[PDB]
C-alpha cells in the first residue's frame, strides 16, 4: 500500500489517478468494504457512520482522471486502508493519522519536565524528532521526555514524525514561566 500521513484535526487528500485523462466510474471504500463515495456522491446515506459529512472529492478534477478522497477534521480512528477502484484497477492507500500534545494545558515552570506524546493509531511505531526554540534536536519514539525546561525553551517547538518513510510536521507552543 501507498502510505499517507495525516494530522489530527487537519484535512488529508488521498490521490487516485486513472490510466486515461477523462472521467469514468470510480468509488472509494474502506478496509471493511464500506463504500464511501463515487461519481454519484457520498454513499453514507444509510445511517450514522464514522466519516459522515467529512469525506469529499474534487468533482472538477474527475475529467482529468483524478479521483481524490479528501477527509476533513481528521480523527486518529480515521486511520485505515482506503481503496480507490476505477474500472478494473484498484489502488490501496494506508492513511495513518497522528496528533501531538504536551503534558500541560496552560504553562510550565523553569526546571520542570516536559513529555511530548504522539497520539498514534494502534500498532504504529513512529519515530519523532523535535527541535526546541533554542535549536537543540531530540529524537525518540512516540513519547519524548525532556528532563528540565529553561526560559529559553519558551516558544514554538517543531516536531517531525517519520513513519513508513513518510514525514509530517507539527508545531506546538510551549510556555515556560519564571
Amino acid at each position, epitope marked *: 500500500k501507498k502510505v499517507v500521513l495525516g494530522k489530527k484535526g487537519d484535512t488529508v487528500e488521498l490521490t487516485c489517478t486513472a490510466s486515461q485523462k477523462k472521467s469514468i466510474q470510480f468509488h472509494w471504500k474502506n*478496509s*471493511n468494504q464500506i463504500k464511501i463515495l463515487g461519481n454519484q456522491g457520498s454513499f453514507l446515506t444509510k445511517g450514522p457512520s*464514522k466519516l459522515n459529512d467529512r469525506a469529499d472529492s474534487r468533482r472538477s478534477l474527475w475529467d482529468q482522471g483524478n479521483f481524490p478522497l479528501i477527509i476533513k477534521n481528521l480523527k*486518529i480512528e480515521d*486511520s485505515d*486502508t482506503y481503496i480507490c477502484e476505477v474500472e478494473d484497477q484498484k489502488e490501496e492507500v494506508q492513511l495513518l*493519522v497522528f496528533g501531538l500534545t504536551a503534558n500541560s494545558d496552560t504553562h510550565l515552570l523553569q526546571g520542570q519536565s516536559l513529555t511530548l506524546t504522539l497520539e498514534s*493509531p*494502534p*500498532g504504529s511505531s513512529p519515530s519523532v524528532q523535535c527541535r526546541s526554540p533554542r535549536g537543540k534536536n531530540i529524537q525518540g519514539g512516540k513519547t519524548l521526555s525532556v528532563s528540565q525546561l529553561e526560559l529559553q525553551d519558551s516558544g514554538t517547538w517543531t516536531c517531525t514524525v517519520l513513519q513508513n518513510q513518510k514525514k509530517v510536521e507539527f508545531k506546538i507552543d510551549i510556555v515556560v514561566l519564571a
Partner: nanobody, 121 residues
C-alpha cells in the same frame, strides 16, 4: 453476547513457533489479539477485518507474527514465530469494534480470559 475462549498457550522454547487459537460463540465483526505481561500495560498485537481481507499487525511484531481467521469455524488465530523471552505474556482474544477501522481503534467490546505464553530462554 459473544463468548471468546483462547487455547494454545503453554511453556515454549526461545526461537520456536506457536499458534494460538480463539473460539467465538461472529462472521460480521473485527477480531484482535492483545498481550499483557506482569506489571506492564496491555499491548496491541494484531487485528483482522470481518472478511479476513485486511490485517493489522503491530509494527514491532510485523514479519514475526501473523493473524488469520475462519468464519465457518468462528475462530481467529495468532501465529508466533522466533519467540523471545520478551514475548512472555497472557495473550487475549478480542472481538467487535462496532464497525471501526482495525487500523484506527483498538476499543474492542468483547474479551477472552487469555492464554498464558511463557518463553523459556
Amino acid at each position: 453476547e459473544v463468548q471468546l475462549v483462547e487455547s494454545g498457550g503453554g511453556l515454549v522454547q526461545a526461537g520456536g513457533s506457536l499458534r494460538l487459537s480463539c473460539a467465538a460463540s461472529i462472521s460480521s465483526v473485527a477480531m484482535g489479539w492483545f498481550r499483557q505481561a506482569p506489571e506492564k500495560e496491555r499491548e496491541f498485537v494484531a487485528a483482522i477485518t470481518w472478511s479476513g481481507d485486511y490485517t493489522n499487525v503491530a509494527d514491532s511484531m510485523k514479519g514475526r507474527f501473523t493473524i488469520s481467521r475462519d468464519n465457518a469455524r468462528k475462530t481467529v488465530s495468532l501465529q508466533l514465530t522466533n519467540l523471545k523471552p520478551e514475548d512472555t505474556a497472557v495473550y487475549y482474544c478480542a472481538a467487535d469494534l462496532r464497525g471501526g477501522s482495525i487500523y484506527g481503534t483498538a476499543d474492542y467490546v468483547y474479551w477472552g480470559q487469555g492464554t498464558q505464553v511463557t518463553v523459556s530462554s
